[PDB]
């Protein structure tokens, strides 16, 4: 029941910024993920507990990377791939990042189990890496895409086909944004924070050199994860709050936060291409 | 045969952004390059194959770094060094980056020869590091500066002397931009990409620990190289395309791409100061 103002964005800057970031991410992710997949699955033919997690993470990152050219084309020019490809691209994009973040949490939990009390950790670790991982990471990721699989379709306006997500009301958008941010940030973030601290608290009892290596590594991992993800989720959260009509600063702030969300969503994709460097320490 | 629009740029932001980036690069590059030159050439007095490549790369980076104060002064205030110094600075700037990128490619090729088949690699490696490297990296770099050595001169306008590159027509500018991007990006990039992948494909046959170190290192190198160079060359390529009158979005896009090229050219100089950190793993 208020005056609508439509979004205005820096299209000229986006048309140059999105393709180059997408190209960098595509090249680096293809290289790293293909190399690690070739190293782990194709040649070893005998995998340990951590190798399965690495392979799952690499598969998720490659699945995310595959859809990047479609996003680049959409950013540069009109959508030219049809409704079915729009749905498939959206589904893959939603699945891949959820899978990657849940694999991050699962790797953290496996390290917790393996490091603190390893005397009786054989059976739980084996069961977690064999059976629980599937129903933990892949099934919920597939289930959460039903709204994406249903409500995503291409719209015809003038000449420009629009591959966008259409929701019948703002409530649907809000509920889905809150669920996305809640899961993705809160759950793995809390798991990692309550995990690594206890791990290195227990390490310092009798080991003198592994403790400093772990202190350096966990801080690196936490810094990278948070610097990659926090601004995007902060933008989404404040956008949801202003969509709930509890934040009223006008709507120039709304255009500013929309630009912030777009730029940070473009930037946050570096996680997929940067994961293979971070998690090359698993076997030691 | 169209309406000309002149470039408009954020001079106020540039006057603060260029000096600080140039100062950071100058300090870091002087420190690192002087230290590595002192370590390698002045004290060792007996060099291996990789040490010669390191010394060449350091010399190229130092040559690039030397000219930075002139660029900083030009960005801040008027040109006050004369025509001959303008020509010399342009020649050194053109030579140094070409030399550095070709040395990158040559180091990659030397690693390819040394790692995959080292049983019969003695003579080719020795010949490549002794004779071929000169005519490979230094001679073409000097030859490519003839247009720079000829067409670069200072122009007098009002009071402001302008140290710029003057070409009699747009075709000369286009041909030279295409040659620059083609060589610098396509050749070493393809060499490195087709090199490191095969290297670590061959490593995994019988070695278990060197493979993960190489997988981490090559991905680091590729990510750094591409993140440093791709946006600048993308800006140059799209500027050439819009100069060829095959891209017509107005010319606000032209001002935006000119600003993007300026900022990315300022940012891409971090390669010279960041090389000594990346390539400290050569001897192992």
């Amino acid at each position: 029941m208020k005056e609508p103002c439509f979004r205005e964005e820096n299209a000229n800057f986006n048309k140059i910024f999105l393709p180059t970031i997408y190209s960098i991410i595509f090249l680096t992710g293809i290289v790293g993920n293909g190399l690690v997949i070739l190293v782990m699955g194709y040649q070893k033919k005998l995998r340990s507990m951590t190798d399965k997690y690495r392979l799952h993470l690499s598969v998720a990152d490659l699945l995310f990377v595959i859809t990047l050219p479609f996003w680049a084309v959409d950013a540069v020019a009109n959508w030219y791939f049809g409704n079915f490809l729009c749905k498939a691209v959206h589904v893959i994009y939603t699945v891949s990042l959820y899978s990657s973040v849940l694999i991050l949490a699962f790797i953290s939990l496996d390290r917790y189990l393996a490091i603190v009390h390893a005397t009786n950790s054989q059976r739980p670790r084996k069961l977690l890496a064999e059976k629980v991982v599937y129903v933990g990471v892949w099934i919920p990721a597939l289930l959460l895409t039903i709204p994406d699989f249903i409500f995503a379709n291409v719209s015809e306006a003038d000449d420009r086909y629009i591959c966008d997500r259409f929701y019948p009301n703002d409530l649907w958008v809000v509920v889905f944004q809150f669920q996305h941010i809640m899961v993705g940030l809160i759950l793995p973030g809390i798991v990692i924070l309550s995990c690594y601290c206890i791990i290195i608290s227990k390490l310092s009892h009798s080991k003198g050199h592994q403790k400093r290596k772990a202190l350096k590594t966990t801080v690196i991992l936490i810094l990278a994860f948070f610097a990659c993800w926090l601004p995007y989720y902060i933008g989404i959260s404040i956008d949801s709050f202003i969509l709930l009509e509890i934040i009223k600063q006008g709507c120039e702030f709304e255009n500013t936060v929309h630009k912030w969300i777009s730029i940070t969503e473009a930037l946050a994709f570096f996680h997929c291409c940067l994961n293979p460097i971070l998690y090359a320490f698993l076997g030691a | 045969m169209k309406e000309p629009c002149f470039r408009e740029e954020n001079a106020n932001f540039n006057k603060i952004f260029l000096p600080t980036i140039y100062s950071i690069i100058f300090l870091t590059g002087i420190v690192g390059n002087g230290l590595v030159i002192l370590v390698m050439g002045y004290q060792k007095k007996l060099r291996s194959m990789t040490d010669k490549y390191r010394l060449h790369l350091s010399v190229a980076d130092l040559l690039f770094v030397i000219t930075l104060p002139f660029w900083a002064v030009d960005a801040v205030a008027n040109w006050y060094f004369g025509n001959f110094l303008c020509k010399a600075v342009h020649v050194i700037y053109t030579v140094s980056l070409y030399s550095s990128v070709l040395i990158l490619a040559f180091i990659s090729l030397d690693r390819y020869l040394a790692i995959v088949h080292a049983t019969n690699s003695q003579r080719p490696r020795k010949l490549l590091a002794e004779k071929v490297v000169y005519v490979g990296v230094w001679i073409p770099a000097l030859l490519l500066t003839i247009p720079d050595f000829i067409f670069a001169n200072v122009s007098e306008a009002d009071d402001r002397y302008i140290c710029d590159r003057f070409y009699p027509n747009d075709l000369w500018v286009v041909v030279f931009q295409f040659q620059h991007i083609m060589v610098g990006l396509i050749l070493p990039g393809i060499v490195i990409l087709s090199c490191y992948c095969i290297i670590i494909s061959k490593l995994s046959h019988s070695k278990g620990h060197q493979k993960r170190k190489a997988l981490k290192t090559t991905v680091i190198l590729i990510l750094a190289f591409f993140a440093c160079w791709l946006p600048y060359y993308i800006g140059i390529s799209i500027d050439s395309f819009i100069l060829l009158e095959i891209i017509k979005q107005g010319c606000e896009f032209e001002n935006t791409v000119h600003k993007w090229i300026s900022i990315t050219e300022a940012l891409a100089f971090f390669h010279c100061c960041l090389n000594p950190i990346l390539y400290a793993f050569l001897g192992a």
Partner: antibody, heavy 125, light 110 residues
Framework: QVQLVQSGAEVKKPGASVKVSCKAS????????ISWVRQAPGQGIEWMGW????????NYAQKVQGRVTMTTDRSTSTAYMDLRSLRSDDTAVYYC???????????????????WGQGTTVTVS | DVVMTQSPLSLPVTLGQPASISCRSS???????????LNWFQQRPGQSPRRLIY???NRDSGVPDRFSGSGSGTDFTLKISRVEAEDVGFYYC?????????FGGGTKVE
């Protein structure tokens, strides 16, 4: 195919209120806004207002603001426009036109003006 | 806000030769991205207005080749290369770049 159907012609006394209905069929009703426009006899087509039919942020024109309301219905996929303070010059032909595009990530307003309704005429005496 | 005038107000034309109608806006109808939005509507009597060309110089599917538009900046026009007996009706030019939208004055073809 996509189409918009309006109601029948109406005659009303001055000072009364009128309700005009616009049923849209053939496409997703919750992805495009609806603009109501008026054509007077012997006068150019003049805009009055627009309703987004998705978050319901209606917007008016100063010539008509303060005497008109717009209300949508997703279940019936219909748009209603109520006009009060009826005057002598309000006799004209009202059209219901699809205007703008609304989505989660695309909320512009320069993509539309494609399909028009059959148009309903109202007179006063 | 933007005000337009159409020229000429009345253009009687004999069947068999092309005709032109020109309208100019109060200000430049160029959006931030460098694109321009201006469309031309034809209304036959008793019918709802029909969208001939949507973006300037670009026509929809399903109309003859006779209609074609051209223009830029502030000045836009539509030319019919051949007048047919079924091309009689009112013509308007409207812009959708600024809020709110504005229609044209209206041109009658006889």
């Amino acid at each position: 195919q996509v189409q918009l159907v309006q109601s029948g012609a109406e005659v009303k006394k001055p000072g009364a209120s009128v309700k005009v209905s616009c049923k849209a069929s053939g496409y997703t009703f919750t992805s495009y806004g609806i603009s109501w426009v008026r054509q007077a006899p012997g006068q150019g087509i003049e805009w009055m207002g627009w309703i987004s039919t998705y978050n319901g942020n209606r917007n008016y024109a100063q010539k008509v603001q303060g005497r008109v309301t717009m209300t949508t219905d997703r279940s019936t996929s219909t748009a209603y426009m109520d006009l009060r303070s009826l005057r002598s010059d309000d006799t004209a032909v009202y059209y219901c036109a699809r205007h703008g595009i609304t989505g989660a990530r695309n909320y512009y307003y320069h993509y539309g003006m494609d399909v028009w309704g059959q148009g309903t005429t109202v007179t006063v005496s | 806000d933007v005000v337009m005038t159409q020229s000429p107000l009345s253009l009687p034309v004999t069947l068999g030769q092309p005709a032109s109608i020109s309208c100019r806006s109060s200000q430049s109808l160029v959006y931030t991205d460098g694109n321009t939005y201006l469309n031309w509507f034809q209304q036959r009597p008793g019918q709802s207005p029909r969208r001939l060309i949507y973006k300037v110089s670009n026509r929809d599917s399903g109309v003859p080749d006779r209609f074609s538009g051209s223009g830029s900046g502030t000045d836009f026009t539509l030319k019919i290369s051949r007048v047919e007996a079924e091309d009689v009706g009112f013509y308007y030019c409207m812009q959708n770049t600024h809020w709110p939208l504005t229609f044209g004055g209206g041109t009658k073809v006889e």
